[PDB]
Amino acid sequence: RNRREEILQSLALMLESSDGSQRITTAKLAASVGVSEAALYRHFPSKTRMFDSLIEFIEDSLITRINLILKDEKDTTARLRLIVLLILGFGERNPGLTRILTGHALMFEQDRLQGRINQLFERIEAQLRQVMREKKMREGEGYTLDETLLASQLLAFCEGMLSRFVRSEFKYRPTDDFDARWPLVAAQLQ
């Protein structure tokens, strides 16, 4: 419990630091929390279980927030904006977990970790599409273009922002000048 979260806390921190761009070792991980490699194994046999837990936090944070958005806001465009702002914001609030979202931190690890991340994206995108398809019945007029195209377009912008966020060592923040950037994104909605 206490030790387990400590290990996860240190992993997230390691993922966000200068070591974040390199392979994390079970040895280093143990050192950062001040325990032996053997002791760490008692909680996590591998780093795979660790990443699973992190990815689970990512899924929960985003999916949960997306549902709250859909309930508290009914305007299609506002929904889209909030969701995009949520994704960008979350990445900014979690530099280390973003590298997991972007797939860089998972290069080292097992393929089912990336697979789980892709599913999260497919999931968010499906939600994006469903939100878009309801514009018609809600506003009396839907989008002229294919919702699939607009959803992928919308998620692509997010992945692009996060990708630059990660490769810039978190210098280029996702929500920077968002009020200026969003109207341009919305304009892409046809």
Binding site: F57, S61, R65, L86, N94, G96, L97
Partner: peptide, 11 residues
């Protein structure tokens, strides 16, 4: 949006 932060700076 109360965006959750995995890492706490109280630690």
């Amino acid at each position: 949006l109360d965006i959750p932060a995995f890492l706490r700076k109280q630690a």
